[PDB]
């Protein structure tokens, strides 16, 4: 049993850490809009989109029952981007930077 407001207090600093990465978090701060970005096949490749604003909303409204559901969503966001984008691309390398930041920040929090 984890109180959702206790989850938010424990977990939101790990999310604020990702938002602080500028410009690395900018591709991730809102859901990918495939028409606006001119990438119409995005939803064919990415079946379960995820982004920072969606995770933040789930945190703020108590949608996470347990800390691994949050980690699963953050990892999903990263895996989607690594899947869709080429290894040589700007978004892929920004994703790798965010994942580096996240792994450093989430590791002690999960120990709590």
Ligand X SMILES: CCOc1ccc(C(C)=O)cc1NC(=O)c1cc(-c2cscn2)cc(-c2nn[nH]n2)c1
Interface with ligand X (CB under 6 A): 23, 26-28, 30, 32, 37, 39, 81, 84-85, 91
**Least spacing, CB of residue 8 vs ligand X, in Å:** 24
63 sits in which H/E element: none
Nearer to ligand X by Cβ, of 22 and 111: the residue is 22
Q: Are 28 and 98 contacting, i.e. CB atoms less than 8 angstroms apart?
A: yes
Nearer to ligand X by Cβ, of 37 and 110: the residue is 37
Report how far residue 4's alpha carbon sits from residue 7's, in angstroms, rounded to the nearest whole number: 5
**Least spacing, CB of residue 103 vs ligand X, in Å:** 19
Nearer to ligand X by Cβ, of 21 and 109: the residue is 21
Omega prior to 23 cis, within 30 of 0: yes
Phi and psi of 36, rounded to 5°? -65, -40
């Amino acid at each position: 049993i984890f109180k959702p407001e206790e989850l938010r207090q424990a977990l939101m600093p790990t999310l604020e850490a990702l938002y602080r990465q500028d410009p690395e978090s900018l591709p991730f701060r809102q859901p990918v809009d495939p028409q606006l970005l001119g990438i119409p096949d995005y939803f064919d490749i990415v079946k379960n989109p995820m982004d920072l604003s969606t995770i933040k909303r789930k945190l703020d409204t108590g949608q996470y029952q347990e800390p691994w559901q949050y980690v699963d969503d953050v990892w999903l966001m990263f895996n989607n981007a690594w899947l869709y984008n080429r290894k040589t691309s700007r978004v892929y390398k920004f994703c790798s930077k965010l994942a580096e930041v996240f792994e450093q920040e989430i590791d002690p929090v999960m120990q709590s």
